[PDB]
Amino acid sequence: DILIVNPDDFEKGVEEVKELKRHGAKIIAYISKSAEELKKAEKAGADILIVNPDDFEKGVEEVKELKRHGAKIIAYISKSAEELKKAEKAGADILIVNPDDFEKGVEEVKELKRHGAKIIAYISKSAEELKKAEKAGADILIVNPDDFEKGVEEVKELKRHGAKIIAYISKSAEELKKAEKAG
């Protein structure tokens, strides 16, 4: 459902976004540490702007800069529920848990669910881990694979399971086109 470009550089990232826009991709996302870079992604056809911050102080300023800019949909990646609560404040629409540890990740999800966070997302290589994140209150299940053929099967399994919203992270529009085909 959501195709997430993980760019090598500005130029290559924009080329993938443009190719997904050309393909007729429905919901395109782009990951960067920088509001300025994200603004050039939104132009090329990205619907979701994902802040992946160096540190939390720096991350929240990029969210306030995209909020001032009038970005349609802002997402924030963090290991911590506490950082994501404050990311939401500055106007992050989607709070993305990128955990060190499965056990810890799911507790981050439960904590956000208690606080009544707007939209919760969870990144994992594993459909089985994402099923459990969903149980704990994740709305968006993000497949971040170790390899392509393996990634696309995890998408097909989350489709069979019945996920609200499936996302996939790739460097490659070619990979993202097949992930969309898979659900």
Residue numbers in the entry: 1 to 183
Verbatim from the authors:
Here, we investigate the capability of a deep neural network model to automate design of sequences onto protein backbones, having learned directly from crystal structure data and without any human-specified priors. To assess whether the model could perform sequence design for de novo structures, we tested our method on a Rosetta-generated four-fold symmetric de novo TIM-barrel backbone, a (βαβα)4 topology consisting of an eight-stranded barrel surrounded by eight alpha helices. Of these 8 designs, 4 are cooperatively folded proteins, as indicated by circular dichroism (CD) wavelength scans and by the presence of clear two-state transitions in thermal melt curves.
We successfully crystallized 2 model designs, F2C (1.46 Å resolution) and F15C (1.9 Å resolution), and the crystal structures validate that the sequences indeed fold into the TIM-barrel structure in agreement with the designed backbone. F15C adopts the full TIM-barrel fold, but for two of four monomers in the asymmetric unit of F15C, one of the β-α loops shifts to interact with an adjacent monomer in the crystal. However, we note that F15C primarily elutes as a monomer in size exclusion chromatography, and the interactions observed in the crystal structure resemble crystal packing, rather than a stable dimer interface. For F2C, the model uses an isoleucine to wedge between the long and short helices and forming a Tyr-Glu-Ser polar network that extends to coordinate the loop from the beta-sheet to the short helix; for F15C, the model has a different solution, designing phenylalanine and valine residues (F10, V14) to pack the long helix against the shorter one near the top of the barrel. All of the folded proteins designed by our model have higher thermal stability than the initial designs reported in the original study, with melting temperatures for 3 of the 4 ranging between 84 and 87 °C while the fourth protein (F5C) remains folded at 95 °C.
